[PDB]
């Protein structure tokens, strides 16, 4: 949940961030691109 | 607008967009102010205290 990883609006270019929020957003986008590899015009390097 | 500024300074409703981001002295600590320093970025005109 987001409350264990709060992104509070901060004064200036500084912005309080965290780490896991990028790790599984990375897994989200990786699943998206592997879906790109899942369904259309896709050779065995895909399944690998 | 500047006309809106001078109107709000005399008439009109409360200040719409302020958030009261003014800094206040922390709780408990007291004292007497003795000096004020101001630093301004180039281009910005200095206020009367500066």
């Amino acid at each position: 949940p987001p409350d264990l990883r709060p992104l509070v609006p901060l004064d200036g270019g500084r912005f309080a961030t965290s780490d896991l929020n990028d790790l599984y957003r990375r897994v989200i986008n990786r699943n998206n691109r592997l879906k790109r590899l899942l369904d259309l015009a896709a050779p065995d390097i895909i399944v690998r | 607008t500047p006309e809106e500024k001078l109107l709000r300074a005399i008439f009109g409703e409360k200040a719409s967009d302020v958030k009261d981001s003014s800094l206040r002295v922390p709780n408990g600590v007291s004292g007497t102010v003795i000096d004020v320093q101001v630093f301004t970025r180039d281009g910005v005109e200095k206020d009367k205290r500066a």
Binding site: - | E3, L6, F11
Partner: protein, 330 residues
């Protein structure tokens, strides 16, 4: 600082209700009270800022008089021949310059004085604009109905007031409805709302006919009297100076069509058009009609009229509070 004083005087909200010389005098008074608050003594000073473009150049009033109390504003007549004063009152000289008209307390008192002055200006403007409609009827929503009086919206910042004594237990009010009347008194020298409109005055109905009855207004008829016990009985007495019209038959309309209209406009009050005569005897006889009167006497030294009625029409002779008589005595 002069640029800011300009920006202010030219960037006012109500350029019409607040003329330019009014802004000048308001700024002068604000800076005057600021300079008063400056010094620990009490000395009256005007700033006389250049009305068009320039900045201020204050003065110092001294009030030529043989007194000594508050010598800051005291100059004796004998010790005043210097500087070519030679006068008894008006020694407003330039002994004081260097006014500060932009600091915190000065800005606050100037804002306060400006608020007071624009309030006074809008009051004066509304009163001397809507006072022209003093004889005619005024239409407008009610701002708010209080206990002592009710205040009414008439237009753009337009306020009127109707007193409580002129109200009725059956005449009733709440913010939102439009109640009309006649502007009976205007006190532009008062402290607040000064547009006093009443409804219980008799001539009111006269002007009602003036906006309804076509016979009145052209001098062909002459609405002479009006007896108005508000909510009880509102009779009218007219006279025709021409020889081709009738006093009552033309004004009633067509079997109570316009008279009942003005009645339900007044609040459904019973309105009966009486015909007064050149003598008070027939006048009071008709005022207590339809009924019989066995004796009509007039007394000048007592300033009274003895009206002794007969038995047979009491239901119309007295009524409630002797209204059929109460109008005549009124």
């Amino acid at each position: 600082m002069n640029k800011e004083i300009l920006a202010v005087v030219e960037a006012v909200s109500n350029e019409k209700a607040l003329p330019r010389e009014k802004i000048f005098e308001a700024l002068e008074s604000a800076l005057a009270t600021a300079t008063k608050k400056k010094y620990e003594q009490e000395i009256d000073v005007r700033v006389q800022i250049d009305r068009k473009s320039g900045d201020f150049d204050t003065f110092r009033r001294w009030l030529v008089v043989d007194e000594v109390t508050q010598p800051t504003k005291e100059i004796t007549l004998e010790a005043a021949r210097y500087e070519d004063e030679s006068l008894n009152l008006g020694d407003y000289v330039e002994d004081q310059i260097e006014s500060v008209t932009f600091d915190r307390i000065t800005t606050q008192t100037a804002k306060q004085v400006i608020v007071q002055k624009v309030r006074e200006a809008e009051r004066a403007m509304v009163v001397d604009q809507f006072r022209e409609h003093e004889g005619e009827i005024i239409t407008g929503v009610v701002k708010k109905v209080n206990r002592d009086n009710i205040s009414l919206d008439l237009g753009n910042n337009a306020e009127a007031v109707i007193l409580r004594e002129d109200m009725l237990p059956r005449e009733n009010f709440r913010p939102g409805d439009r109640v009309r009347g006649v502007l009976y008194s205007v006190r532009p020298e008062a402290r607040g709302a000064q547009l006093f409109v009443t409804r219980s005055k008799p001539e009111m109905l006269i002007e009602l006919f003036r906006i309804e009855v076509p016979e009145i207004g052209e001098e062909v008829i002459e609405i002479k009297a009006a007896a108005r016990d508000p909510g009880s009985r509102a009779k009218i007495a007219v006279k025709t100076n021409d020889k081709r019209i009738d006093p009552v038959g033309a004004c009633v309309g067509m079997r109570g069509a316009r008279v009942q209209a003005v009645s339900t406009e007044l609040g459904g009050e019973r309105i009966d058009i009486v015909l007064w005569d050149d003598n008070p005897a027939q006048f009071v006889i008709n005022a207590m009609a339809p009924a019989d009167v066995a004796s009509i006497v007039v007394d000048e030294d007592k300033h009274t009229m003895d009206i002794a009625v007969e038995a047979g029409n009491l239901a119309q002779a007295i009524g409630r509070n002797g209204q059929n008589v109460r109008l005549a005595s009124q």
